[PDB]
Amino acid sequence: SMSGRVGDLSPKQAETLAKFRENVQDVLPALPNPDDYFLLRWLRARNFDLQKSEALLRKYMEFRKTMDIDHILDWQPPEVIQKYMPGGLCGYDRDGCPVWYDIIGPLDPKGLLFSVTKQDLLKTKMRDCERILHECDLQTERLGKKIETIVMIFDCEGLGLKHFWKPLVEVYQEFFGLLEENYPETLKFMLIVKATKLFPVGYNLMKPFLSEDTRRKIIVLGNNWKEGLLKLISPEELPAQFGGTLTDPDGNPKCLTKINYGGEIPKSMYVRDQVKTQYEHSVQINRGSSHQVEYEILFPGCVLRWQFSSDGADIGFGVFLKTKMGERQRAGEMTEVLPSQRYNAHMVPEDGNLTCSEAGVYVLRFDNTYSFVHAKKVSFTVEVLLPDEGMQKYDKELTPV
């Protein structure tokens, strides 16, 4: 079989290329380098189907306009992103392919999304797409061989419940979706290092946004992850932080000159205290009454996630565990999970989550015991975030928490 790459095309692939081009006659005037290489990414992504490859390319032309890709290398992100958005482009693998780091642990999710918008974050990620593509083009020049694929490293140390706040999850979802739509056939490997026991839930949140091609390229490294990275990346190209010998000019092993390590964003940089949201349910509760919902959990390891808002007085909220569905239980008859407390959910919504570490029926209960009024409207959403079953197979090498 032929791989559908320049210098390795079958007669059919070549004829399909020559045709697709004839065909993408009217959009080509807009591109900086529509070489055979460029066209063939689209074709490979859709198995050389002319109509699907064309439709995919045409959508990308629209993305170019929406994101102003023509000028994006000159676009300056907000200072909060420059200073506190983790990751960066650093080094090249053993084959010449550029490496892109993300450092998930120290991300401040609310700090970021209360300081900048989802669109500023996504535009920054697309700017980094365009920067790493330019590194591919420059490596091609340097090495005398075609470089058009990249290595993504996700340092998942410290991946935890804070990261499952829905607005942050949505940024990452949209980012992976943008890569699939606009950067097909660009990924060499996505390497997951130091993943925690929460990785299967996190991955399942992203999975719907990953192509089958991408999913086959995801490698979950274990305890010997430094050796694993060194198999792919020479020590002189791999930060000492990640097992190599590359440092900043001053010797810092973190390579801070190229890789950001996040951190807590100063509250003085915030532009808002909440993001807009809609709720799945709204209920009216009586003075001194309660309202609850119940989830029958058979398979431990899923994450229960909630958000609520209520005008007026504070509202009570807690989570309890009982053995099976049945008539209403008193708090003291159930296993406390999250003991009830008083929350001000009027100025800003309350959100939270927890890991369901035992099978049973989880009861999320609102207690209206703080209004000096007749009754009370509570708006809320509760979701269960399931673990990816295939990734639970790595459980023994995933770090607690």
Swiss-Prot record:
Q: Which residues form the GOLD domain?
A: 276-384
Residue ranges constituting the CRAL-TRIO domain according to the UniProt record: 77-250
Q: Which domain of life is it from?
A: Eukaryota
Q: Name one GO molecular function term.
A: lipid binding
> Any idea what job this protein has?
Probable hydrophobic ligand-binding protein; may play a role in the transport of hydrophobic ligands like tocopherol, squalene and phospholipids.
Q: Which InterPro entries match?
A: CRAL-TRIO_dom, CRAL-TRIO_dom_sf, CRAL/TRIO_N_dom, CRAL/TRIO_N_dom_sf, GOLD_dom, GOLD_dom_sf, SEC14/CRAL-TRIO_domain
Identify the GO cellular component terms for this protein: cytoplasm; extracellular exosome
Which Pfam family, just one, is annotated for this protein?
A: CRAL_TRIO
Please identify the protein, giving its name as recorded: SEC14-like protein 3
Sorted UniProt keywords = Lipid-binding, Transport
Q: What PROSITE patterns does the record tag this protein with?
A: CRAL_TRIO, GOLD
* Gene3D superfamilies per UniProt: CRAL-TRIO lipid binding domain, GOLD domain
